């Protein structure tokens, strides 16, 4: 229960809208703003009978949340008509809930948002009113690739929703959300990078500074066995090839570790891959924040000599960016579920599942979607390799930390870097309202 | 320099034909016989500058010998025409060789035998017609299945060779081959079963023994969990799926061990599987002979708690058929290659490859072909599934030890056990010559 979080104007304004008011609110930052920090400070220090949810199972386990389809008992094929037949597991709850938070709201499609509103409108405190009158708190990175919509759905989805963004859902317009944008980049020496990114957001590109970009299209391929460059790909398939090809053409023995599921857990979504295949000298990424304060979620390293085990489970030493030769051991992930405790006036969260695996994954290459909400010091913006579609360039650039660590494989650097101005329309509406 | 071999008439007659004479010889056993015993006693205690070969890489590593393709530089697709263009790696050798042994000759197809004869006809010591004069010693079990012949090659193979068995090759006919059959059953004592099996051999079975066979012809199932049983299948696909089905169902944690290849080896013929996926409580097969004298090749067991005490490597504790608790650790297999050294005026064997892996594999089900030369106390004979072969039943029955341990999946059985009388013809020719 600590207080070491630097309460600035935006932070204090957001907490004001959150706790003392019961208004629907939308808080955005871009990577470093304190989205998880603000959410969790509210989460720990409130008595407001709240429920914290997240779109994916990976996002839910990280925030210790409830994996929304599970919280509402939504089948993978849910629709605005089938939602009406859903019987709540925990019917007694959603009458008592005062507020509900949703993290990483960027990747919640419009149809699912409308299903949520209908569900809370029928089972909420005040039925008929938006969300049953329950205060809704949205937290996410607007500067994100919209939720994909398969080719089959495309024809009629285009006719129901203007965009797969959550903010183009009919329920979001009929309800008023106070807008708060986190602008402060904490623990960030990324000076002039965010100014460049904000310049790319607007029409202020200052193409002298655009060609100040044109300086880092080096090719000559290459990297180093030391410089920890990560490839950002558009699809799993390409990231999956770079991980394997780098894993091959590499000597030493491979070590394979199988994740263990206790209780109930889906595969996917797993934070760490189920089969951890590590050779000596393998570039890896750590997928959780260390309690002991040694590495963070996304801290890259290089697998080094494993000492083998004493009578406990074996460890994987890793050579971090700064040093560091840290012993990584398997980490326990838990899958929560919120419920009301009839005994007292409180909503408790029991754990229905456990998952055990080394918190690491091969980190020679990653996909943009997998790297949502992460910044890497040295990145490689690789080939498409089948379509570099509209507005994917601003997101990929927003994955980087500095310009002197950015290497652009293809020197494309042209006039569709622009953030995909559906978002831009939404932001210019709310910032000036 | 061991002398513990109890040199029975058959044995002394076979060694006499081997050592003092230079005649081609054909020794057959029934896998309880002294085949490996005779081969290794001759191998160790001789001064005859010989070369020991085996068809597969697995059979070669077990006998500490070389594969036929490796010794002759035979490409996987060799034909009798292309053999003439093969340049020997070690041309100088095959002038010095006095004898050549070939173990597990049962699984040597006719075309390969003719290629061997042609090669030694061209490069051998005094390279005339009979293998270039090199004395050939063949050792194998005739009671095993013939070497498979793909459907494509079948049409024209059928017209050149009457059967894919080695004795229907050409060379053999114009080859003086003394015949010795090890018929005496080396104990573990085979009392009722070998008499019944030999009765099926000579088609002299009695319907008293058919009815006494029909007694273990029962429907239903299950293995008594401890009680070790195995399902002998016709195909890898069926047997290996049963190993997976028993492995998924059973609870606990998975442990994955990767074999390490040093130098040069093969991925097709490995003694232990390359990826050992082992759960606690899993039936295993202990697939090599322990020097310390704790378990034999084929001695089945059930994995019990794996004590991962390390500062080098962890140990897999296994409960044998009698008892038990043996610590199984990785075993080193080596791939030899013979060469002639004028300095010692003899045939030395250097090791060009090494393979390290725990000598274990899941043993809920294995294929007849994999289990060549083995007897198991408790066997489950399925239907193939389906109608196994013309003559697969006799081999499957010859895999068993006793009738009070053989369990036949289904009573259909009517009479198709009969030995594959191409073998019967050959055996009645040589036994009465
Ligand atoms: N508002 C803030 N006050 C104090 N520290 C912050 C704040 N925002 C970010 N930080 C620092 O930055 C780090 C990452 O913040 P985080 O909450 O993960 O940002 P986001 O959730 O936007 O990714 C935290 O470890 C914290 O130390
Ligand atoms: N000549 C022999 N003298 C004594 N015991 C033998 C002899 N041959 C075989 N045995 C017994 O049979 C076992 C297997 O013999 P082996 O040569 O491996 O048979 P095969 O080659 O037919 O599998 C040996 O462990 C041994 O105890």
JSON list of N, CA and C in Angstrom, two decimals, chain A residues 348-376:
[
{"chain": "A", "resi": 348, "resn": "UNK", "atom": "N", "xyz": [-14.99, -10.56, -3.94]},
{"chain": "A", "resi": 348, "resn": "UNK", "atom": "CA", "xyz": [-13.72, -11.27, -3.90]},
{"chain": "A", "resi": 348, "resn": "UNK", "atom": "C", "xyz": [-13.44, -11.94, -5.24]},
{"chain": "A", "resi": 349, "resn": "UNK", "atom": "N", "xyz": [-12.18, -12.31, -5.43]},
{"chain": "A", "resi": 349, "resn": "UNK", "atom": "CA", "xyz": [-11.71, -12.90, -6.68]},
{"chain": "A", "resi": 349, "resn": "UNK", "atom": "C", "xyz": [-11.00, -14.22, -6.39]},
{"chain": "A", "resi": 350, "resn": "UNK", "atom": "N", "xyz": [-11.65, -15.33, -6.68]},
{"chain": "A", "resi": 350, "resn": "UNK", "atom": "CA", "xyz": [-11.04, -16.64, -6.50]},
{"chain": "A", "resi": 350, "resn": "UNK", "atom": "C", "xyz": [-10.28, -17.06, -7.76]},
{"chain": "A", "resi": 351, "resn": "UNK", "atom": "N", "xyz": [-9.32, -17.96, -7.56]},
{"chain": "A", "resi": 351, "resn": "UNK", "atom": "CA", "xyz": [-8.42, -18.45, -8.61]},
{"chain": "A", "resi": 351, "resn": "UNK", "atom": "C", "xyz": [-8.87, -19.84, -9.05]},
{"chain": "A", "resi": 352, "resn": "UNK", "atom": "N", "xyz": [-9.25, -19.96, -10.32]},
{"chain": "A", "resi": 352, "resn": "UNK", "atom": "CA", "xyz": [-9.78, -21.21, -10.86]},
{"chain": "A", "resi": 352, "resn": "UNK", "atom": "C", "xyz": [-8.73, -22.01, -11.62]},
{"chain": "A", "resi": 353, "resn": "UNK", "atom": "N", "xyz": [-7.54, -21.45, -11.84]},
{"chain": "A", "resi": 353, "resn": "UNK", "atom": "CA", "xyz": [-6.54, -22.09, -12.68]},
{"chain": "A", "resi": 353, "resn": "UNK", "atom": "C", "xyz": [-5.14, -21.68, -12.29]},
{"chain": "A", "resi": 354, "resn": "UNK", "atom": "N", "xyz": [-4.18, -22.54, -12.66]},
{"chain": "A", "resi": 354, "resn": "UNK", "atom": "CA", "xyz": [-2.77, -22.24, -12.49]},
{"chain": "A", "resi": 354, "resn": "UNK", "atom": "C", "xyz": [-1.99, -22.74, -13.70]},
{"chain": "A", "resi": 355, "resn": "UNK", "atom": "N", "xyz": [-0.93, -22.00, -14.04]},
{"chain": "A", "resi": 355, "resn": "UNK", "atom": "CA", "xyz": [-0.06, -22.31, -15.17]},
{"chain": "A", "resi": 355, "resn": "UNK", "atom": "C", "xyz": [1.38, -22.02, -14.78]},
{"chain": "A", "resi": 356, "resn": "UNK", "atom": "N", "xyz": [2.27, -22.99, -15.00]},
{"chain": "A", "resi": 356, "resn": "UNK", "atom": "CA", "xyz": [3.66, -22.89, -14.60]},
{"chain": "A", "resi": 356, "resn": "UNK", "atom": "C", "xyz": [4.56, -23.07, -15.81]},
{"chain": "A", "resi": 357, "resn": "UNK", "atom": "N", "xyz": [5.42, -22.08, -16.07]},
{"chain": "A", "resi": 357, "resn": "UNK", "atom": "CA", "xyz": [6.39, -22.13, -17.16]},
{"chain": "A", "resi": 357, "resn": "UNK", "atom": "C", "xyz": [7.41, -21.02, -16.98]},
{"chain": "A", "resi": 358, "resn": "UNK", "atom": "N", "xyz": [8.62, -21.26, -17.47]},
{"chain": "A", "resi": 358, "resn": "UNK", "atom": "CA", "xyz": [9.67, -20.26, -17.51]},
{"chain": "A", "resi": 358, "resn": "UNK", "atom": "C", "xyz": [9.18, -19.01, -18.24]},
{"chain": "A", "resi": 359, "resn": "UNK", "atom": "N", "xyz": [9.22, -17.84, -17.61]},
{"chain": "A", "resi": 359, "resn": "UNK", "atom": "CA", "xyz": [8.69, -16.63, -18.24]},
{"chain": "A", "resi": 359, "resn": "UNK", "atom": "C", "xyz": [9.57, -16.05, -19.34]},
{"chain": "A", "resi": 360, "resn": "UNK", "atom": "N", "xyz": [9.67, -16.75, -20.47]},
{"chain": "A", "resi": 360, "resn": "UNK", "atom": "CA", "xyz": [10.56, -16.34, -21.54]},
{"chain": "A", "resi": 360, "resn": "UNK", "atom": "C", "xyz": [10.06, -16.89, -22.86]},
{"chain": "A", "resi": 361, "resn": "UNK", "atom": "N", "xyz": [10.50, -16.25, -23.94]},
{"chain": "A", "resi": 361, "resn": "UNK", "atom": "CA", "xyz": [10.17, -16.66, -25.30]},
{"chain": "A", "resi": 361, "resn": "UNK", "atom": "C", "xyz": [11.28, -16.22, -26.24]},
{"chain": "A", "resi": 362, "resn": "UNK", "atom": "N", "xyz": [11.52, -16.96, -27.31]},
{"chain": "A", "resi": 362, "resn": "UNK", "atom": "CA", "xyz": [12.56, -16.56, -28.28]},
{"chain": "A", "resi": 362, "resn": "UNK", "atom": "C", "xyz": [12.32, -15.15, -28.80]},
{"chain": "A", "resi": 363, "resn": "UNK", "atom": "N", "xyz": [13.38, -14.33, -28.77]},
{"chain": "A", "resi": 363, "resn": "UNK", "atom": "CA", "xyz": [13.27, -12.90, -29.02]},
{"chain": "A", "resi": 363, "resn": "UNK", "atom": "C", "xyz": [14.27, -12.46, -30.07]},
{"chain": "A", "resi": 364, "resn": "UNK", "atom": "N", "xyz": [14.37, -13.23, -31.15]},
{"chain": "A", "resi": 364, "resn": "UNK", "atom": "CA", "xyz": [15.05, -12.73, -32.34]},
{"chain": "A", "resi": 364, "resn": "UNK", "atom": "C", "xyz": [14.09, -11.91, -33.19]},
{"chain": "A", "resi": 365, "resn": "UNK", "atom": "N", "xyz": [12.80, -12.20, -33.09]},
{"chain": "A", "resi": 365, "resn": "UNK", "atom": "CA", "xyz": [11.77, -11.50, -33.85]},
{"chain": "A", "resi": 365, "resn": "UNK", "atom": "C", "xyz": [10.45, -11.65, -33.12]},
{"chain": "A", "resi": 366, "resn": "UNK", "atom": "N", "xyz": [9.60, -10.62, -33.25]},
{"chain": "A", "resi": 366, "resn": "UNK", "atom": "CA", "xyz": [8.26, -10.63, -32.68]},
{"chain": "A", "resi": 366, "resn": "UNK", "atom": "C", "xyz": [7.32, -9.93, -33.65]},
{"chain": "A", "resi": 367, "resn": "UNK", "atom": "N", "xyz": [6.03, -10.15, -33.44]},
{"chain": "A", "resi": 367, "resn": "UNK", "atom": "CA", "xyz": [5.01, -9.51, -34.24]},
{"chain": "A", "resi": 367, "resn": "UNK", "atom": "C", "xyz": [4.56, -8.23, -33.55]},
{"chain": "A", "resi": 368, "resn": "UNK", "atom": "N", "xyz": [4.08, -7.28, -34.34]},
{"chain": "A", "resi": 368, "resn": "UNK", "atom": "CA", "xyz": [3.58, -6.02, -33.79]},
{"chain": "A", "resi": 368, "resn": "UNK", "atom": "C", "xyz": [2.47, -6.29, -32.78]},
{"chain": "A", "resi": 369, "resn": "UNK", "atom": "N", "xyz": [1.54, -7.18, -33.13]},
{"chain": "A", "resi": 369, "resn": "UNK", "atom": "CA", "xyz": [0.40, -7.45, -32.25]},
{"chain": "A", "resi": 369, "resn": "UNK", "atom": "C", "xyz": [0.85, -8.08, -30.94]},
{"chain": "A", "resi": 370, "resn": "UNK", "atom": "N", "xyz": [1.85, -8.95, -30.99]},
{"chain": "A", "resi": 370, "resn": "UNK", "atom": "CA", "xyz": [2.35, -9.56, -29.77]},
{"chain": "A", "resi": 370, "resn": "UNK", "atom": "C", "xyz": [3.06, -8.53, -28.90]},
{"chain": "A", "resi": 371, "resn": "UNK", "atom": "N", "xyz": [3.65, -7.50, -29.51]},
{"chain": "A", "resi": 371, "resn": "UNK", "atom": "CA", "xyz": [4.44, -6.50, -28.80]},
{"chain": "A", "resi": 371, "resn": "UNK", "atom": "C", "xyz": [3.63, -5.25, -28.47]},
{"chain": "A", "resi": 372, "resn": "UNK", "atom": "N", "xyz": [2.32, -5.39, -28.29]},
{"chain": "A", "resi": 372, "resn": "UNK", "atom": "CA", "xyz": [1.48, -4.25, -27.97]},
{"chain": "A", "resi": 372, "resn": "UNK", "atom": "C", "xyz": [1.83, -3.72, -26.58]},
{"chain": "A", "resi": 373, "resn": "UNK", "atom": "N", "xyz": [2.19, -2.45, -26.50]},
{"chain": "A", "resi": 373, "resn": "UNK", "atom": "CA", "xyz": [2.55, -1.84, -25.23]},
{"chain": "A", "resi": 373, "resn": "UNK", "atom": "C", "xyz": [3.96, -2.16, -24.77]},
{"chain": "A", "resi": 374, "resn": "UNK", "atom": "N", "xyz": [4.93, -2.13, -25.68]},
{"chain": "A", "resi": 374, "resn": "UNK", "atom": "CA", "xyz": [6.32, -2.40, -25.34]},
{"chain": "A", "resi": 374, "resn": "UNK", "atom": "C", "xyz": [7.22, -1.52, -26.19]},
{"chain": "A", "resi": 375, "resn": "UNK", "atom": "N", "xyz": [8.37, -1.16, -25.62]},
{"chain": "A", "resi": 375, "resn": "UNK", "atom": "CA", "xyz": [9.35, -0.34, -26.30]},
{"chain": "A", "resi": 375, "resn": "UNK", "atom": "C", "xyz": [10.71, -1.01, -26.21]},
{"chain": "A", "resi": 376, "resn": "UNK", "atom": "N", "xyz": [11.37, -1.16, -27.35]},
{"chain": "A", "resi": 376, "resn": "UNK", "atom": "CA", "xyz": [12.65, -1.85, -27.45]},
{"chain": "A", "resi": 376, "resn": "UNK", "atom": "C", "xyz": [13.71, -0.87, -27.91]}
]
